Design a protein around this ligand. Structure first.
Ligand SMILES: Nc1ncnc2c1ncn2[C@@H]1O[C@H](COP(=O)(O)OP(=O)(O)OP(O)(O)=S)[C@@H](O)[C@H]1O
Ligand SMILES: Nc1ncnc2c1ncn2[C@@H]1O[C@H](COP(=O)(O)OP(=O)(O)OP(O)(O)=S)[C@@H](O)[C@H]1O
Ligand SMILES: [Mg+2]
Ligand SMILES: [Mg+2]
Lengths: 251, 290, 290, 251
């Protein structure tokens, strides 16, 4: 009934509300804005002594990288808040509520992703207003939203399941960071070394951790039919597992 | 809220064993037992924080259950008031300002309700936690030592407030608690849990007091004093560890003191007073350790 | 362990204000007050968990201070026994097996001492935590509601054990606690802290003039009972009309009852009425809320 | 007096004792061993169809990378254990103890670093026993110890100070990982872009975070006189700050 739905949404509202009140959020936004403005101002308009013309695509990709990381950390905090304060015990009292808890968090993750995508959009629009160059297609920004939604929801639900499996929070933040910064590190470090190097590299296109992390610094994207399906399928199964698990795990 | 044949073990440690429970048209049920018996476990099963209890937990899920288990659960960087609003909106039906205020002022937490929880004392956190549970405007309230950290006055006002509320709302309250004296303030029955099952069902409808007299003797005189008193008066309870024998109240101590003197027994103490859950408790549990 | 002019505030909230404290050759000092008064704060200052108290804390650092503040502190994935060994080696002088055992069995925690702490109940954790503090074989022991989660028997045995230890070790014990009845078991004084300053001290070894034992006898026995009490006690009052004689409070009636029995006198009723720390507490603090 | 020193050491012993009992330690060791054996077996002896002759230096560097990360996490756990369990409150009761606490942890960090270096040594000795190639100089392994001691102590004390400053543990594990995997990521991503690119890159030689992280994957090292001094100086000041801070921070 709508009463159930209402209670679920009320929890969502509080998590988002918190994001918009903590000064930390505001700080993080200012940091991103500063870094982007810095790149634009310092060299995009000056390195080759151009007549102040820049590549928004370079800015775009950098902004995405930063916001996806900050976003993922916001997602992790959203996920771990109840384990941290121990308040989870007050929610998981019956199946209807336990399931609603997962639903609420899933919704919050989606809304966080939307927020970050909106920030990304705004930062880049300001850059476009500020200098010269051909503006990016609206549809490019839209596809960027899709990337954010998928990236963050995939990692969010994955980490959520782990959080519930272990009931630890320190290692969730650790994994969020670790996974993001390991793919781009390890690829060029050793992928080329084994006789299976090419095999391994090709394999990454079918592994969401690898391809979603790699695309975090791309100016654009185009998922292959398989790659698209695999990522979305992974999201669906994690969601399902979270439900099946929460329904059985003692708190 | 009924429990049928509940059995729960942790590995080889059986905590609950075929334990049954209900509210026989009662409203306030106290739960008494020693530490390690399983009071929290029972409450968790009822709350539904356990799904491995091998038995039937009969709950009309249409109803709300409010509860407080072990240490209080609050969001530390938020105000007390914030937590009340959140839970009312989140676990409850919605935030009822008037209801909330009655609880805040009845508990007397008002002066610090707008301060952050991390700045609260243990006592303050418990007063708030009780209120948080109440904010769901539940029918079943389950409290794990609700006055554990409260001061003498806090305990009385909080407990009194809850009793008022059980009529305002059609509630059933389960209170697991030490401080039998607090249970005695607000109760209409109590159950004594031992070795995974209920041992006594103690019903109390009125403050009948069942006045009793305590006669206290040296441990070397306990056996013969017990024999004398049980044969000539009505023995109600004993506390072997402390040398107490409890008989039906006597106005006049002469007959007992003379008869004991003829047996070369001279009490360390004697007094007429009201009956208590404490005496009931010791009679049942003292032999574990003593 | 002396406190001179201690003042402590959190922003505008003054908790302690020019508060002084000492042990006037006493051993067991209870600390009583309402929740929000600052009992923990005082203890933290003494422990040295606070360095912003604007005053002098006089501690011979040569000595060890053991303590327990708020919820118990233990390593959750380790056994109870592990924690005792660790702290004895780490904060204490070393691990004393015999000492440790006396505490474990006196508290009765033995059956679960080898189990992991995370599997412990709240009560069990407190019994262990008290033992952890004791393992330092400290001189000053500071306990924040040490029996807060203990059952009736646990509390008595733990408190009794500590009192024995204060002689075995030259200790001074500060106990902040609700359950005035527990303080009354083990104490030789108590201090009442209200409004951020000490308000009333009580010397438990002195009591008051009104603390009297009343003996009631048959009229025909009165003169000979009065003779006996006059020769062996101090008669504070004599009501021949009603058969009552008042002496200073007696803890143990055996001497009187045996002596009267040799005179073939058996009192009908013996009673002592002395004010409880609870009554003292309410008199002082009830007006805050009421 | 020695009594003080004894109590400090007893705490150290317990932290190390814990490391040697948890199955997680054993798992981590096996993982490293497996990965090294895997590289040796799969391609070092086969990629170019050599007569089973390998470069121990490639193995050496990889092993170092893995052990330094695992090591740093062990260090972080050692640091945060008392905040996590709340047991820190039982230690910080007086200055002598508060200071001793810092000393104890410093010693534990050093011993952890030694342990990891010993593991590294053993893994590589096994590899040398197993296949052909010119064995690495004993003195190279020794210098590798020095690297471990410095790397881990620098990060350890830095993170320790943060841990004490914030009294949070989730963010300590996060920083440990983040810092390690960010330097090698960011360098080639944008260092070359600004007109100050060369200036920035050169600057990294004087910034311990950058140069210590970068050398984690080197087969060897040689610190410049400045670089050597800067790192060691940084360790000393962190140690000092930890003491000054613990002596004043309410617990
Ligand atoms: N997570 C757990 N793992 C293993 N044993 C447990 C766990 N939780 C509780 N127990 C055991 O279950 C028994 C009863 O536990 P509880 O329900 O917490 O006790 P209780 O009746 O609430 O007692 P208190 O805490 O002193 S009121 C004890 O013997 C505990 O050791
Ligand atoms: N970290 C803190 N920040 C702000 N205020 C605090 C903090 N800790 C305690 N207080 C306040 O200091 C006052 C006294 O606190 P405590 O020492 O914890 O009280 P208490 O006498 O131990 O009471 P209990 O917990 O109920 S026995 C209260 O008004 C608290 O709100
Ligand atoms: Mg319990
Ligand atoms: Mg307190």
């Amino acid at each position: 009934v709508p009463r159930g739905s209402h209670r679920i949404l009320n929890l969502v509202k509080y998590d988002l509300y918190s994001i918009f009140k903590s000064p930390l959020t505001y700080l993080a936004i200012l940091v991103v804005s500063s870094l982007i403005a810095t790149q634009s101002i310092l060299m995009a308009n000056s390195m080759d002594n151009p007549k102040h013309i820049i590549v928004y695509g370079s800015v775009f990709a950098a902004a995405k990288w930063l916001l996806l990381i900050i976003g993922l950390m916001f997602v992790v905090k959203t996920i771990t808040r109840d384990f941290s304060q121990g308040t989870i015990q007050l929610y998981m009292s019956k199946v209807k509520t336990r399931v609603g808890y997962i639903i609420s968090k899933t919704i919050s993750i989606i809304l966080i992703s939307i927020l970050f995508a909106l920030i990304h959009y705004v930062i880049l629009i300001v850059v476009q207003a500020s200098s010269n160059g051909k503006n990016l297609a609206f549809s490019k920004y839209v596809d960027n939203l899709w990337f954010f939604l998928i990236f963050l929801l995939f990692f969010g639900l994955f980490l959520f399941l782990i959080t519930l499996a272990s009931q630890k929070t320190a290692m969730i933040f650790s994994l969020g960071v670790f996974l993001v910064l390991i793919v781009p590190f390890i690829k060029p470090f050793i992928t080329f070394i084994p006789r299976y190097g090419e095999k391994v590299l090709d394999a990454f296109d079918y592994i969401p951790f690898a391809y979603l992390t790699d695309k975090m610094i791309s100016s654009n994207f185009d998922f292959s039919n398989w790659q698209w399906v695999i990522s979305l399928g992974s999201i669906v199964i994690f969601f399902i597992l979270n439900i099946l698990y929460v329904a059985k795990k003692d708190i | 809220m009924k429990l049928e044949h509940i059995t729960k073990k942790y590995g080889s440690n059986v905590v609950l064993n075929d334990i049954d429970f209900d509210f026989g048209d009662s409203r306030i049920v106290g739960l008494i037992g020693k530490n390690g018996v399983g009071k929290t476990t029972v409450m968790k099963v009822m709350n539904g924080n356990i799904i491995k209890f091998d038995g039937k937990v009969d709950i009309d899920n249409a109803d709300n259950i409010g509860f407080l288990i072990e240490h209080p659960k609050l969001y530390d960087n938020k105000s007390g008031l914030y937590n009340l609003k959140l839970f009312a909106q989140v676990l409850g039906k919605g935030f009822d300002k008037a209801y909330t205020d009655k609880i805040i002022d009845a508990f007397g937490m008002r002066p610090y309700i707008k301060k952050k929880v991390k700045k609260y004392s243990m006592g303050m956190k418990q007063k708030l936690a009780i209120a948080v549970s109440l904010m769901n405007k539940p029918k079943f309230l389950i409290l794990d030592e609700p006055t554990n950290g409260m001061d003498p006055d806090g305990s009385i006002d909080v407990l009194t407030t809850i009793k008022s509320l059980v009529n305002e709302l059609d509630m059933r309250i389960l209170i697991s608690s030490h401080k039998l004296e607090d249970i005695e303030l607000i109760c209409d029955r109590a159950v004594f849990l031992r070795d995974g099952h209920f041992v006594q069902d103690v019903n109390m409808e009125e403050g009948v007091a069942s006045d009793t007299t305590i006669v206290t003797v040296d441990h070397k005189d306990f056996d013969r004093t017990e024999k004398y008193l049980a044969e000539h008066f009505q023995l109600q309870n004993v506390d072997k560890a402390d040398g107490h024998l409890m008989i039906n109240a006597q106005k006049n101590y002469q007959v007992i003191l003379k008869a004991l003197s003829e047996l070369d027994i001279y009490p360390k103490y004697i007094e007429t007073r009201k009956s208590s859950l404490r005496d009931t408790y010791f009679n049942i549990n003292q032999r574990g350790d003593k």
